[PDB]
Amino acid sequence: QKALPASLVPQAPPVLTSKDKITKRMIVVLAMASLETHKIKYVLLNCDDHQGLLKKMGRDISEARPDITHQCLLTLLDSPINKAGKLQVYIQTSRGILIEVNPTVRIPRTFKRFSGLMVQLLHKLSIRSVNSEEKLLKVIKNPITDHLPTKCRKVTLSFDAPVIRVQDYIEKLDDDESICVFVGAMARGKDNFADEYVDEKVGLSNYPLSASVACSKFCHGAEDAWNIL
Amino acid sequence: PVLTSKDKITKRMIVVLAMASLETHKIKYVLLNCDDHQGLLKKMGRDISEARPDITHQCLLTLLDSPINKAGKLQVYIQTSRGILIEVNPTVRIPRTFKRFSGLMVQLLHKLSIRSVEKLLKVIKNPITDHLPTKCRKVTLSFDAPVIRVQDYIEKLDDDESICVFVGAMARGKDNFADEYVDEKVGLSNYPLSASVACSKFCHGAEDAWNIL
């Protein structure tokens, strides 16, 4: 019943960046990423591969698992919302290092190459594309708050918090605003790492959720709510 | 109750990880990997692209950690590319690290079963159909197939029925691995999906459809 637009050809949606604050977007903060490097050549510290070394540092090797961040990044990066260009990722290392992840990046699927990329990133403070046109991974200045959109809602994943429906939550929120999730990549710990920034903490379920599952479960809600498909 | 292949009446979500690239090679037997063994597989004549058991580990991790597994409504079957079919007990907690996953798989393939004190991981005789529920619908993940809402799909199906999803863990290949058993192929999302995301993509809707929460 309606004449088609001037140009129907699908065009790639804009790649969201920290500079742009107006657009509604999805922000996921993989807070408390356990990413540490040490000269043996520098290697990303691992719970299993390195046990004696971290004992010498005096850090509990239970909190020495970067693969949890890898899987969360993998499931998060490959989500269709990222393909729609409506999601942009931040990582807050346990040390206090904030890493900005450009949505365009394609991290390696295997962990070994993933570790090689972290050590390069942490030492060089930035990662350049193969074509050398953009910095996919870049370390940025804390706090996270300045980078976040001017109008935005902040929430954390809390097991003890009331269980909510992700789809109903996103619908009732306004449109011009954005939503931030602060996910705890730690294996086991108290959920107060983002208390200072967040205003209210939400639980996605009653039963415990893995970090990757919660990220995957949450983003499906936005895609259904936003009709990303 | 823990779901098992013996029980067929109960409605459940079956996920078949077809084209799983799990293989043990002895120089001691170790799971072949794309990165760990590059020169050896070059000698074998097989391309290193299709030598990635990481994908199956990722798909198993999301599936087993998925809600519906916690609610006792999911069972996983893995069909190795060599022709080995593996049943996964829903109660298992597979190693989260890949290196320990590889060591578990080599134990499974050689010992044919894992016992810790009902086999957690058990190799069982093909075909898949005899193990599957008597009344059950079969579908595959096809990018070319029409895009269907996973939620709306599940409600319009019956209640006594169960649903089987055949996901290809292969890095690259034609989506005809399960054409012989499946009756129709469907598309889950409009964009291309990895096997892990598709499993995560699918399971969330059944949780919504069946109100697993």
């Binding site: 394609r106 190459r113 | 994908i55």
Partner: peptide, 11 residues
């Protein structure tokens, strides 16, 4: 163009 579960090239 990378798609699906393809991994980045190894050199």
């Amino acid at each position: 163009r990378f798609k699906g579960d393809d991994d980045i090239p190894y050199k």
